[PDB]
Amino acid sequence: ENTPLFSPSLISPDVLAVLPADYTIRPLCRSDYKRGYLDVLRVLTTVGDINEEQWNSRYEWIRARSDEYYLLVVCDGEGRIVGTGSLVVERKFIHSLGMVGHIEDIAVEKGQQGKKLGLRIIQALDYVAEKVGCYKTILDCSEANEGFYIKCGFKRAGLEMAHYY
Amino acid sequence: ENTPLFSPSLISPDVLAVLPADYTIRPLCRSDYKRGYLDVLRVLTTVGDINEEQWNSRYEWIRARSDEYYLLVVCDGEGRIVGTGSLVVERKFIHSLGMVGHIEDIAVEKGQQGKKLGLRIIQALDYVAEKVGCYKTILDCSEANEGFYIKCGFKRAGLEMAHYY
Numbered sequence A, B: 001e002n003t004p005l006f007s008p009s010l011i012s013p014d015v016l017a018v019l020p021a022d023y024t025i026r027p028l029c030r031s032d033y034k035r036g037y038l039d040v041l042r043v044l045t046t047v048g049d050i051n052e053e054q055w056n057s058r059y060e061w062i063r064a065r066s067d068e069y070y071l072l073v074v075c076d077g078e079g080r081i082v083g084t085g086s087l088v089v090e091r092k093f094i095h096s097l098g099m100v101g102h103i104e105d106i107a108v109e110k111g112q113q114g115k116k117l118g119l120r121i122i123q124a125l126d127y128v129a130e131k132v133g134c135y136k137t138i139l140d141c142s143e144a145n146e147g148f149y150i151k152c153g154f155k156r157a158g159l160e161m162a163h164y165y
């Protein structure tokens, strides 16, 4: 229930050293369903009603693929989930069978925004991608939050195109 | 050796109906290493020397994940690989445990460009994403090829940001 999704060694030690007092950054675990996880995602976009059985099934799917999916959380110093982020590591043939990190689903509870938590999430996901051998990490963002990603040391690389069904 | 990576039923019948005479669109198979596959990817970006053993290992990794990775090819009417495209299907918690299709590594041999082959690749990957239950498909592109994606029925949705190691 409390077993981390992936090795705690994958959490950047430099990030751990600089996080605000009593805050924690750590891998997701199954029991995080009970600690406000999905409510944090609600700042990003819509989530829907997800029951515990459905959570458990999707969590186990992800856990079976813990060398592709890295989901982590930031907890306040009450252990409440206040921030989320994901890295998905894609395998390619190009770049001598290279791997690309994709940062996804970055969210910080409104009341906890503007305290460097999002920066620490991005730094932590960047650390994972580099450590496992990715040649780059990419993500898509809006014009309104490009400046956040600039401050995280990302640069504009292209355009996101979409087709919604 | 010739076994398709994924079910031929996942190849859009409408696309099959409209492809240029004697051209084929089909899933990747292991033996495509021998039919010019990696040379097509060289129009996109750099590939590197990949030997057959390395190909086989990465192919088998992908094949083990054929419900996440869909790689397909366009063959001319000599059965030579002249176009490539990939869809990677990401699992989310948001959107009621939704899935997002990611189109990757689209390439058409220079001599075979401008004949609707890239369009057919995108239509085929779109068909797979919708059929397996994705709520959208996204990709990143350059300013110089945005017009191609417009003609494929995609719309600008945001910015791609990158951090190269």
Ligand SMILES: CC(=O)SCCNC(=O)CCNC(=O)[C@H](O)C(C)(C)COP(=O)(O)OP(=O)(O)OC[C@H]1O[C@@H](n2cnc3c(N)ncnc32)[C@H](O)[C@@H]1OP(=O)(O)O
Binding pocket: A043, A044, A103, A104, A105, A106, A107, A108, A109, A112, A113, A114, A115, A116, A117, A118, A119, A120, A139, A140, A141, A142, A144, A145, A146, A147, A148, A151
């Ligand atoms: C890949 C994706 O998932 S894109 C989707 C990102 N998520 C969202 O937009 C959902 C709503 N927003 C949020 O959850 C958060 O505000 C985030 C994730 C965008 C940023 O996290 P925060 O914890 O609020 O920001 P954090 O304090 O770490 O910001 C670091 C720096 O960027 C600044 N910043 C934060 N958001 C923005 C913005 N939209 N534009 C410009 N600057 C910003 C901060 O003020 C800070 O600046 P400083 O170094 O001068 O102090």
Ligand SMILES: CC(=O)SCCNC(=O)CCNC(=O)[C@H](O)C(C)(C)COP(=O)(O)OP(=O)(O)OC[C@H]1O[C@@H](n2cnc3c(N)ncnc32)[C@H](O)[C@@H]1OP(=O)(O)O
Binding pocket: B043, B044, B103, B104, B105, B106, B107, B108, B109, B112, B113, B114, B115, B116, B117, B118, B119, B120, B139, B140, B141, B142, B144, B145, B146, B147, B148, B151
């Ligand atoms: C997600 C990614 O992988 S992005 C990377 C895409 N790949 C590359 O850029 C590598 C180099 N280029 C290529 O491999 C190819 O030219 C592709 C994939 C971009 C396009 O494939 P093609 O087979 O050449 O194009 P196709 O003939 O299907 O094009 C469909 C329509 O778009 C047009 N078109 C093609 N490329 C472009 C472009 N860069 N800008 C504007 N229009 C374009 C065609 O002329 C055609 O127009 P029409 O309907 O008026 O005839």
Ligand SMILES: O=P(O)(O)OC[C@H]1O[C@@H](O)[C@H](O)[C@@H](O)[C@@H]1O
Binding pocket: A044, A045, A046, A103, A104, A105, A106, A139, A140, A141, A142, B094, B095, B158
């Ligand atoms: O609900 P959507 O319209 O799919 O938006 C959600 C998406 O926003 C993008 O900007 C982020 O890069 C993605 O990580 C996130 O999944």
Ligand SMILES: O=P(O)(O)OC[C@H]1O[C@@H](O)[C@H](O)[C@@H](O)[C@@H]1O
Binding pocket: A094, A095, A158, B044, B045, B046, B103, B104, B105, B106, B139, B140, B141, B142
């Ligand atoms: O070699 P890179 O710099 O990683 O470029 C290759 C990448 O180009 C992008 O525009 C495409 O969306 C990706 O699918 C492709 O993987």
